[model samples]
Target: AYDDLHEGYATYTGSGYSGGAFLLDPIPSDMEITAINPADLNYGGVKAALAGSYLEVEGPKGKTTVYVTDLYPEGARGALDLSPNAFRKIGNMKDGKINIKWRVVKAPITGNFTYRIKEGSSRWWAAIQVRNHKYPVMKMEYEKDGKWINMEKMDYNHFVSTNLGTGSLKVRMTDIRGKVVKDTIPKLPESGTSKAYTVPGHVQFPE
Candidate 1:
């Protein structure tokens, strides 16, 4: 036996993102991102561990770098599921799926790091992801009023806040190595994307 529960928008809690939902973060790289079915990974010389990793994809039309955001179902390497933006860069939309070679490669990120405010975010609920950090993110904090509040890190590797008021936010990120970077972000708007560079010039961030 099974049970089902349904609620209208009025009951919405303004939290919890659905699986397969897209967030603008991991801001597009010079290379595009592509999705391959799980079963096809081994056949394509790709690995399950490569998820969230970058790939260099070369098609007859052109080549671009893309992140492995998802793994498709089991099958004989059917086709590369790419974002329309990424698809157009290498092949024609009319052509639909095309033959391509993809291999994992280091992402070309320089400077401090990058941040992308999650979609559907608001003053009441804020979510941020630290990408291309030179070191693994250990913890993150944001300034509220005059105090700093540590954010809860999600399994998907994002720092989140609830009930933060609207204002410029000071963010401090600590890496696994205990190295810290701090920055004051101007008032963040809902569903906005922002970039930050290291205070030291030309520091190469990790993949």
Candidate 2:
């Protein structure tokens, strides 16, 4: 989904986001971000993969880069609800909204992505999240019996596998452009929240 230009209207909102709310995590308003239409992000029945990806938006005023964090549920396919700060980068907030063109783009990041096992995850049930990803993750798969099984994505963006089982984990991740990367996650670190326990994935996508 990279660099596929699409037309849309850009608007700003701060209401409800007082919590710094986002489907993937709580992001502050000072950062550049966009609340996109879910339908526009859904491709081939897969959704939610764009949660942490970046988008390049161009308006009459200028161009801005924004991270995909929120979903504008009632918006049409090509609508973008940008953070006031992000909107101002492209057009005046006094204008309220502006017509624009936007597309998903690789996030500027260093190193490979990280894997965060949700709290309470155990041998029987596991929920994992891909963080610091440069591209959209279309699928997160867990290896079992020499076969890869799909992990369902939760609304909050964690991929869950109910019967992940005990032992080593071999994960296969697929991005929106169909590139694949595999990595073996090391043993779980001491139990704790995400920041203290996420393991790094060695493989990274080619930019």
Candidate 3:
């Protein structure tokens, strides 16, 4: 027998995707928040868990300062799957000025993930990283439009396959430093290709 009703249950609500237009961060009450931006605190909407007991805060737009709190608060554990924020242009494609910024909480981690830019017309491996994960890591790709590049996976720590892209994009990871992470070669996908960083535990949220 065929059934549309059962499949309909899996359909998402009519809301369109948000693509991390807002930022997510792990805020534990235990850590010392010496500084913060009023805008972050004002627009801060949701609180979710990250690695273990770490909590991440979600906002409607890019935020500057963060609300500081301890890493392990005494309460029920929580998590959230935020909408995909639209892509923000922090860098200029022509002048080679692309920058982005954001905040995150990691327990002394580094190079946990690897990113590779799908070679575009120029043929180059631009950049790759973990997107919007509790421990956020984004790889950036940059170069003149007509170059070709290739990247090999790190032997010890290969990419999770969840993080990869093909394009010459620039961004500032939450007020963090800016760098040209990926350079490309020609004869590749003509347009931009991307995959949203999927949060592990997402909840139904109201806009």
Candidate 4:
């Protein structure tokens, strides 16, 4: 799995980053993140199923949600590595690493759900991903001509479409729980831009 990615960079293609890697992009500036160990994944009750999902970790200092980004070597499953900021949230850096308990939880995202058009996207072919979502995204569709066009959900968790033409894009997203949310964002922005289009409303699930 490690040899497939170019320089550890995840892409929309096969065997890419665990979960939707784009959500962690521009990784928090406050603390530098190196990589995550596979073992850390096991503790969160997240094998591969929950990668890219949020994790609530409890340590000596406090608790914080850490996004799973990469996989550590299989032999190193007993050890876990984390971002410096995440480390401090749980314990002192001097301790290097400490014992902790963690579990997967619905992400407590505030405000709107965000959509990021891939940097190389164009009217002919485009890729998009959902962020700040609490549940696993089950489907993503774009609206066109009063019809809904399904976008292929990539292994990396991006929705891709090759038939989208120019116009404002409306996307209907469904979560793992069968709840659905629909919203539209203006056409794709310039390539390599930091801007993100947000769809109003929050995601909630039935008890």
Candidate 5:
């Protein structure tokens, strides 16, 4: 399940920078987020192209809301705000996949990339692939009734095959305090399976 993305999240579709081209620490999210205000306006011809995307989950059901603020290219700084409901927080996806081989589970399978998060914590997870530029993903920290939970992992993919020209993809997961505990910046996979994956796109659940 997924929540509704605010307006601060950015989206890029060959548009301009504000169109939603921004860089994260390392991880690049599949869904774009923006403030509700701008998202209401759909600024600079930038629309919520791919907001509110998520993989399925079990347990307490920690969902996320994503957004697409604008479009741009190369280097830009995008902002996003994540707010979970009641006593829920975002957590790693039980069905997130980066390499397409995982798709073999479902015919015409649909899945998202993967990131590693510690057991149970309210922290944002960030990962990236830096080739021509840097694509990143930032998960937010969610706390409820004193317990902490990480924001949901959006169904994003870098398609490392094309995104990484020569440079490598760097990933880092940290707490809100700005501490890097999980750093998995591996070189481009020599040759794996990646193809024909589907993104449902725009998960519009409520906050």
Candidate 6:
């Protein structure tokens, strides 16, 4: 039902300069990020399935497109807390709130898949968080023993694996549309690394 159109109320998350509540690092405003009520964002257990997806929304002032990035925990279903840039494009901030109707749309083609190796990571224990995705990642698996082992996705948006073998690790990332992209992380990044690296030679998904 995520792709279905819904009626919702829109509000601002914070001051124009404030940072986002979700995502390890705040995404740039140019990305048109917004937060939706958790109740409305639910997708089985992978609540993050909505992240990075596009939403075309309309309010009293006009219309604008936004990217799913954070959770608006306090709002009712259909509620959205937009950032200043996204909010301004559709409604007046002084109005406090405005009624909105929005629906999911395909993301404009852009960057390839990128992931972060958590700080405590190493060949033995690691947490990988996928981002820069144009769609919600449904699952992630790593190759071990010539087999793909599924990683556990945590609430914090991390896919955890333990006692991993060395050398270039192969990760298979699958999105909601069954679009799959595979990447090889160079011997895995060091623990506590802050960089987000893109997988080379990755392609696009338009579904």
Q: Pick the candidate with the highest TM-score.
A: 2
lDDT, candidate 3, 20-121, per-residue tens:
212213333233221122223122221221111111232223322222221212112121221112111221223221122333433232222222333221
Error of 2 at 128 (Å): 0.8
Better structure of 1 and 3 per lDDT: 1
lDDT of 5 by residue, 75-137 (tens): 222322222221133332342211110000011113323432222111122222212111122
Report the C-alpha lDDT of model 1 over 1-207, residue by residue, as the tens digit: 011121111100111112422232334344455555554333323223334445566666787766555544432443456766666776777774467665555555556566656665667776776656544455678888879898876544457887677777788876433456787655655543343222222222333
Model 3 lDDT, residue 68, Cα = 26
TM-scores vs. true structure, each candidate: 0.44, 0.88, 0.22, 0.58, 0.20, 0.81
* Model 1 lDDT on a 0 to 1 scale: 0.53
Runs of candidate 2 exceeding 4 Å displacement? 15-23, 26-29, 188-197
Superpose all Cα atoms of candidate 3 onto the true structure and report the RMSD in Å to 1 decimal.
Answer: 20.2
Better of 2 and 5 by TM-score: 2
Candidate 2's TM-score reads 0.88
lDDT of each: 0.53, 0.76, 0.23, 0.55, 0.25, 0.72
For every model shown, the clashing-pair count is 7, 0, 51, 0, 39, 1
**For model 1, the run of ten residues with the poorest summed lDDT:** 7-16
Candidate 3 least-lDDT 10 residues: 1-10
Error of 5 at 15 (Å): 9.0
Q: Candidate 6 on 107-151: residue-level lDDT in tens? A: 665776666666667777887777666676778899997789988
Residue ranges of candidate 4 with Cα displaced over 4 Å: 1-23, 31-52, 59-62, 68-80, 89-101, 144-147, 155-157, 188-207
Better of 1 and 5 by TM-score: 1
Candidate 1 Cα deviation (angstroms), residue 167: 1.5
Question: How far in Å is the alpha carbon of 172 misplaced in model 3?
Answer: 11
Alpha-carbon shift of residue 195 in model 5 (angstroms): 14
RMSD of each: 13.4, 2.8, 20.2, 9.1, 18.0, 3.1
